C-alpha cells in the first residue's frame, strides 16, 4: 500500500 512498507 505504501511503497513496500
Amino acid at each position, epitope marked *: *500500500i*505504501i*511503497x*513496500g512498507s
Partner: antibody
Amino acid sequence: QSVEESEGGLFKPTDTLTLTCTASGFSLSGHGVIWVRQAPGKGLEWIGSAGAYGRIYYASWAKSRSTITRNTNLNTVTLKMTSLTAADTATYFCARRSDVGTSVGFDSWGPGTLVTISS
Amino acid sequence: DMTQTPSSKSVPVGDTVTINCQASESVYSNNRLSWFQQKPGQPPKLLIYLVSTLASGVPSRFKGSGSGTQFTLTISDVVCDDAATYYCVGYKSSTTDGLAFGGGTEVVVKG
C-alpha cells in the same frame, strides 16, 4: 543518468503495444517508475506504476488490458497493452523517481514516444 | 481524483498567478503531492514535491502550499518562460487508482 522510451510507431487494433523504459547511467531497480500518456489535446493520463519494492499498480481503465513488468537484469520497465483503439493514439512517457519518500516526485523523464493506432 | 481550477489562466508578465488543486480525499500523510510543468512538445518537469519543496534548479518564485485536501501553486514575478500547463499529482497508496493527476491548468503569459 536518464531514461528513454523505446520506439513507438503505427499499430493495428489487433496488435500488442509494447514500450520499454530503458535507463542509461543509472539503475531503475529500487526506484519507482511510472508510465503516463498524453492524447492530442488532452491532459496527462496515468497508465500504471512499478513500485520501488516490487508492487505493480494501475489505473483502473488500464488494469484490464495492460501489464507493466520490471526486468532488473536488463535494467528496464516495460508496458504491454492489448485491445488497442483510437483512444490509445498518444505520446507515451516513462519516468524514474529518485526518492521513494516523495511518492510522486518523478524527476527523470523520458523524451516521450509517439504512438498511432490505425484502423 | 485531483480537481484543478481554473483549467486556463492568463497572467501579465511580472504578476503572480495561483493554481488550485483539490484532492477528493486526503493524500498520504497529507503531503504526497507534486507539481509539474509541461510545455508543448516536452515531457513534464518536476517543480515541487512533498507539497512545498523545490526541485533542483527551480527558482523560489515557485511556491507550493497545502492544508487538508487543498493545495496551491503560486508563481510570482511571472516571465514568458513560465508559459506551460501545470499539473498537480497526488498519491494515497500503491494500489489500483492509488494516485491521480489533476486535469492541468494552462497558464498563458501576457506580453
